[PDB]
Ligand binder design. Structure first.
Ligand SMILES: O=C(O)c1sc(CCCc2ccccc2)nc1-c1ccccc1
Length: 188
């Protein structure tokens, strides 16, 4: 067929009950994730093709970058709690990988301050149990799919995107094939 289990996607042996509809995992330490977000804009092109009533979830992971990787997962939780993802995604990717000016939790915090999140608002979120819960949520979803690498994307806790089994020749073609595959999967 045109879409095949094992080709553009794979099928989890242990499907995940109740998982988010479209679930993306990334790390601000992950160079391929930088490309996905800054150059390919995968998340946004997937969204632009998703059926109505399907929501996209994006979680950070701990397994890259050691101590700072874990701080970034907490900072992504802060970004979600405040709803400022679109304000800090780029400067976090660039601070970690382009300028390499993010070396500590304080440098992470500076990015939010520079984006206009007030210092008191960031600190209260950072220390909140709402944020502790979002951290564990991100960790649980990654654990549930036994996530070893990023970037990754899952649909309905059943299908894992396989960007290698796609037509990877052209890149704009690549993005749209990735996005059409997610649409197809979300329609199964
Ligand atoms: O598995 C993956 O992550 C992907 S994604 C992709 C196509 C993206 C092209 C591109 C454009 C701009 C910047 C970076 C990359 N190819 C692969 C691949 C991986 C292992 C072996 C062969 C192919």
């Amino acid at each position: 067929a045109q879409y095949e289990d094992g080709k553009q996607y794979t099928t989890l042996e242990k499907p995940v009950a109740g998982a988010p509809q479209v679930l993306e995992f990334f790390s601000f330490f992950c160079p391929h994730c930088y490309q996905f977000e800054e150059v390919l804009h995968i998340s946004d092109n997937v969204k632009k093709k998703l059926p109505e009533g399907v929501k996209m979830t994006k979680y950070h992971v701990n397994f890259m970058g050691g101590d700072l990787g874990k701080d970034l997962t907490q900072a992504w939780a802060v970004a979600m709690a405040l709803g400022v993802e679109d304000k800090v995604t780029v400067p976090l990717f660039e601070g970690v990988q382009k300028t390499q000016t993010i070396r500590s939790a304080s440098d992470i915090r500076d990015v939010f301050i520079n984006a206009g999140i007030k210092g008191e608002e960031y600190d209260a979120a950072w220390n909140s149990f709402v944020v502790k819960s979002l951290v564990a949520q991100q960790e649980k979803a990654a654990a549930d799919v036994q996530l070893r690498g990023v970037p990754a994307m899952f649909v309905n806790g059943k299908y894992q995107l396989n960007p290698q089994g796609m037509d990877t020749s052209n890149m704009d073609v690549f993005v749209q094939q990735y996005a059409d595959t997610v649409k197809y999967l979300s329609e199964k």
